[PDB]
Design a protein around this nucleic acid. Structure first.
Ligand SMILES: CC[C@H]1OC(=O)[C@H](C)[C@@H](O[C@H]2C[C@@](C)(OC)[C@@H](O)[C@H](C)O2)[C@H](C)[C@@H](O[C@@H]2O[C@H](C)C[C@H](N(C)C)[C@H]2O)[C@](C)(O)C[C@@H](C)C(=O)[C@H](C)[C@@H](O)[C@]1(C)O
Lengths: 9, 114, 209, 122, 56, 120
RNA sequence: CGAUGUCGGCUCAUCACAUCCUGGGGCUGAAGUAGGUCCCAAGGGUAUGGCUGUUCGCCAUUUAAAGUGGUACGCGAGCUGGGUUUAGAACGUCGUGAGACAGUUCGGUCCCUAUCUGCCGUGGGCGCUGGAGAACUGAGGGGGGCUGCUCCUAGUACGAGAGGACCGGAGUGGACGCAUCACUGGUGUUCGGGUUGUCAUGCCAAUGGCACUGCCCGGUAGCUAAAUGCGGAAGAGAUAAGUGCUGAAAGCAUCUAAGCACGAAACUUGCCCCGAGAUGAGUUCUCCCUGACCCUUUAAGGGUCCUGAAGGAACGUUGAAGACGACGACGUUGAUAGGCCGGGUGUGUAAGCGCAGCGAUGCGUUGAGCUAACCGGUACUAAUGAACCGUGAGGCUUAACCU
RNA sequence: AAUUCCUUGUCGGGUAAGUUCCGACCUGCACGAAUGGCGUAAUGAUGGCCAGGCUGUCUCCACCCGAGACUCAGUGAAAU
RNA sequence: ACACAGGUGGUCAGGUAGAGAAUACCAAGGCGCUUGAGAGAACUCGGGUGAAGGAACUAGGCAAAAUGGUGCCGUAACUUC
RNA sequence: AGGACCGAACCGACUAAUGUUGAAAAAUUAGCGGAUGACUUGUGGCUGGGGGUGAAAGGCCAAUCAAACCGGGAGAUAGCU
């Protein structure tokens, strides 16, 4: 599945 | 067990008339008025009998001045006095909670007449 | 003064002339007998050991049966100790009765609480349940947080948590007494008392004023 | 068993019709109230010629509860619906000249004597 | 929810210490046939407390 | 926490308990002896025996009250007409438990159950 | 930066005192009531809502008061995803433009079965120096510690009036904790009845299956609060701030330097629970065991035969005890469980028959039938006689006794 | 104001109390007429607000019915 | 990648109730789904009911609850009628 | 008569729970939208990688798309770990 998303802290 | 039941039966009164649920039944009630202990009447159709030996008690609804007023009474309590049956009657199902919603003409009960 | 062993029979009520209904719990109390008198000499402190009831003659162990034999009397179902009031001086084998409760006025009723078994934090410490909805998942009656972070970094000792409930010694204080029927060995203490029906009890005079 | 945000029928000819228990007076972190405990209430509805108008807020005493009032014998006097008399906010005493319905015996407490003086039942 | 390190075989064995089985050692001779059988259990031949039952 | 409760859920819904015991009770009657798991047999003892107590006295109504249970005319026919009188004066103890080792299929506690007489 | 999840809310807290309330005082521009300010004191307690994602804040109304902070601005291997903080889009503004804006708006997957430490519980093993059954002593540790209102004193002290106590006593609530089912109620898919559609029992009649327990109306035991009993203390010990007595240094003065007396919800006890693995393993009571020969490195040595006791365990029936263990009770000289008999309780007029009616239905039989988990009795059944574990007098040294 | 920084603009309505909502004022940081302005019946798994009914969403959880968790037997992993 | 709660076009259309191929119970016919036996703790999942209050919960009436059929009476602002 | 209404098949996937090393590399359950049409679907062709197609999300083009996959230049380069 791994997915994606992002890490905008 | 037996020690309990023997203790309970001794306090029980032996002068309680039988009555079918749904019958109109006056319930005299002794009460303090801040001084004098005047008795007061409380007539009303029974809706829920609950026999539990010495712990036995019965609800008595009374539709007065608008909204009705239910009042439970212990069978063996000192506070209660005479329990005369002012009106013979009969209904199926000993419980009568459904009458709580019913009002006016819906509150009718036919006489047992036997 | 000294307490006496009792036995719960079942909660009832005693009607009064004023019409007030006061709940009571029936507690049979067969007369106690002093199997042995503890003292500062041989035992290092003054006290009395007592027993009541009728244990089966076959099931009693010999090591116990000889301990009852020293008293010269048939074995009870169990054994219980009571501290002396210092001014008291009881002979061994004396048949202490329920009549002593005629003047006690108020008494504590020691007993073992009902076994609730293993239980969650909610049943045991009355913790409120979390949200039943609003996106909630796998969390309702759960304790949730139980600590801080790196500081301590350990759960505190004595922390309120889910576990065994009931089945332990307890004593409600200053219960009122009503009737003292020596003829039936009755002890009608006011209100509810700890313990399952038929369970052993230990009634003592209240320390409270 | 009155609590916060609870609608109540008016128990007297104060001209109010429907009310609501915004707050429960008498002690910290208090929840339930009833029997005869004081509760400040907003007036959500009133008849046009009544002494009170809509949106008014004042203390009022409960007179009836669905839960009913308990008695030492174990008997309880349940009622079909909740009701309350509108006491003056400044110094008790009912505003209405007539309290409808059977007030309970527990009201017997000096200050409530004016209320129980009316309504012949109980 | 997972080990940070690998446990010693000793630590595993201490965990295995309670896993040991215990023989019931409750066998009893039949009153009649005399064959051994578990207490409060009928014999494979169907005898029980010396009376004949089952017979299968 | 149970406390003074009786009977056992036996990992089954009550609708199934109203049927499986209903059939097994007849199965115990048809052969006067059956093999079953012990806890289930202890449940069965409270099932079959009352039917026998109902069978102690013949009447038109009791045949139908028996008919409401077991749902087999062949079983109730054995009732009253045969099983009824045979116990006679005896009160209770209509059947007995006899454990017979553990089942090979999953170490299940097997236990035979049977009538006091057995005459077939 | 070969990853330390980032505001708030929910839940759960713990510590500090620069103390919000309660307590003890000083001073007052402190009459009293009620305040100002400062010292001592962390035992306990220390709001619900409306708006906003908000902490905060304002407002409405309580309260004896609605403390200030630390704890990764506590707490996402506990929860929430509204905020912020991706990928869609639009408005305002900026740029020729793609785009951008701690500008705004709508929408947007929150993973992990506990190895160790820690904690809440519950056992196995061993030791405590012969073994075993109970009663324990309490070193130590935890829990509990809140407070209004009203009355008496007293409409007295005080004060012009108005108002209105200090000390002490009595009663009754709010919040919290524990226990309980007797009442008042809830649950009660294992109890009874009503009724819908359909199937089945050959059919009339009567029942059962299924449809969320078909939909319900009730309702035993049990559990449980919303229901009802109790709990905070009093007392004592030593103190903090404080009030002093005597009294010099310093002819006086001074609570202190010698000495002496008072003094708080804090401290030590009292109150409740755990508790001798308290290895510093303690006491007391009671019970059981009083046989014959070799070997070896000759001793707290290794074995054989004869013996197997108290008691325990295992098994079975089990329990208002229980996740599993454990714990309580019962096991044929016997009520442990089931059944059974009687009773109670719930359901409220069974089935069948007869009568009345064209009929659906009603009446009589009849408060009848059916009754789970209740209560009192009953050995009908199931708990078999045994065997198993555990032994055969229990170290050395010293002292006190055996009159 | 899907646009307003100041800002929770001010006033009025709704509520016991309304940084949201409705109406209006215009002091429009930085609306505007086919990069369309304004209005609009009907339509909408659209945004915001109010109310009736309804309710365990909550005050506060309580009990019961099933599936796991637990024990026994058979087979037998995982990240690390 | 599996003896996998997924995906796969057309044709055949019983009885009763019902508007119906909805849905419930059944015929013909096919199945009880390849681990079970127990115990009746928390906690979790799928459900039932709950006294008093009825949105006081919450970012938000989220989720549950509730409304539900046919015949008839009757039905506003507004409108492109 | 209708890109008309309610509502199955069929198609679509708005909310919420469960699931998150699942039964399933996006499902199930309880509700939902469309359902005579700009409908859905069977069968067989057409558009081939800076190209295709797109009621436009830079989505999709065999579970991968701000430039598919396979082989080759290629042991590309890397001042970096
Ligand atoms: C289905 C199972 C998946 O889990 C999730 O969906 C949860 C819900 C994600 O959080 C989702 C949702 C969210 C909001 O986290 C909750 C977001 O922050 C991240 C980026 O993705 C996880 C756990 C993320 O980790 C997060 O990575 C962050 C960069 C740091 C964070 N850590 C420091 C604490 C860590 O938890 C991240 C990146 O997906 C993990 C990597 C390794 C994966 O891609 C793995 C293969 C995932 O497919 C998964 C774990 O199998």
């Amino acid at each position: 599945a791994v997915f994606q998303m992002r890490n905008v802290d | 067990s037996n020690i309990i039941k023997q203790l309970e039966q001794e306090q029980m009164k032996q002068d309680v008339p039988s009555f079918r649920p749904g019958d109109t039944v006056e319930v005299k009630v002794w009460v303090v008025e801040g001084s004098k202990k005047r008795l007061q009447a409380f007539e009303g159709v029974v809706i829920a009998i609950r026999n539990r030996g010495l712990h036995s008690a019965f609800t008595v609804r009374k539709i007065s001045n608008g909204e009705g007023v239910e009042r439970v009474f212990q069978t063996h309590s000192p506070v209660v006095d005479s329990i005369s049956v002012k009106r013979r009657g009969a209904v199926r199902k000993a419980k009568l909670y459904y009458l709580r919603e019913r009002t006016g003409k819906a509150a009718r009960i036919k006489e047992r007449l036997n | 003064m000294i307490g006496l062993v009792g036995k719960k029979v079942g909660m009832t009520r005693i009607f009064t002339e004023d019409g007030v209904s006061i709940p009571v719990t029936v507690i049979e109390v067969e007369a106690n007998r002093v199997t042995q008198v503890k003292d500062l000499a041989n035992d290092g402190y003054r006290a009395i050991q007592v027993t009541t009831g009728a244990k089966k003659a076959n099931r009693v162990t010999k090591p116990e049966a000889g301990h009852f034999a020293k008293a010269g009397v048939e074995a009870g179902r169990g054994l219980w100790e009571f501290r002396l009031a210092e001014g008291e001086e009881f002979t061994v084998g004396q048949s202490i009765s329920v009549e002593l409760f005629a003047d006690v006025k108020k008494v504590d009723v020691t007993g073992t609480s009902k076994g609730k078994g293993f239980a969650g934090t909610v049943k045991r410490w009355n913790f409120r349940t979390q949200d039943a909805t609003h996106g909630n998942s796998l969390s309702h009656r759960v304790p949730g947080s139980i600590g801080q972070n790196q500081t301590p970094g350990k759960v505190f000792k004595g922390k309120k948590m889910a576990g065994q409930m009931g089945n332990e010694r307890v004593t409600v204080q200053s219960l009122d007494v009503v009737r003292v029927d020596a003829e039936r060995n009755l002890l009608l203490v006011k209100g509810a008392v700890p313990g399952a029906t038929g369970s052993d009890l230990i009634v003592k005079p209240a320390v409270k004023a | 068993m009155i609590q916060e945000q609870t609608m109540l029928n008016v128990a007297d000819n104060s001209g109010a019709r429907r009310v609501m228990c915004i707050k429960v007076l008498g002690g910290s972190h208090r929840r339930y109230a009833g029997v005869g405990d004081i509760i400040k209430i907003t007036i959500k509805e009133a008849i046009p010629r009544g002494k009170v108008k809509k949106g008014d807020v004042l203390k009022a005493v409960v007179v009836r509860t669905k839960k009913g009032v308990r008695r030492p014998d174990g008997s309880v006097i349940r009622f079909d619906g909740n009701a309350c008399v509108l006491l003056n906010n400044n110094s008790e005493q009912p505003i209405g000249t007539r309290i409808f319905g059977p007030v309970t015996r527990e009201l017997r407490s000096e200050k409530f004597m004016k209320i129980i003086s009316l309504a012949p039942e109980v | 929810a997972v080990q940070q390190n690998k446990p010693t075989r000793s630590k595993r064995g201490m965990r295995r210490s309670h896993d040991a089985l215990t023989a019931v050692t409750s066998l009893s001779v039949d009153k009649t046939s005399g064959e051994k059988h578990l207490r409060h259990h009928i014999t494979a031949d169907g005898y029980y407390r010396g009376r004949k039952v089952i017979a299968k | 926490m149970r406390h003074r409760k009786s009977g056992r859920q036996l990992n089954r819904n009550s609708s199934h308990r109203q049927a499986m015991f209903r059939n097994m009770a007849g199965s115990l009657v048809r052969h006067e002896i059956i093999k079953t798991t012990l806890p289930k047999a202890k449940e069965l003892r409270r099932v079959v025996e009352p039917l026998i107590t109902l069978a102690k006295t013949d009447s038109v109504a009791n045949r139908r009250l028996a008919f409401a249970r077991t749902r087999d005319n062949e079983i109730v026919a054995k009732l009253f007409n045969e099983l009824g009188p045979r116990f006679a004066s005896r009160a209770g103890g209509y059947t007995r438990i006899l454990k017979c080792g553990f089942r090979a299929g999953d170490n299940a506690p097997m236990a035979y159950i049977e009538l006091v007489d057995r005459s077939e």
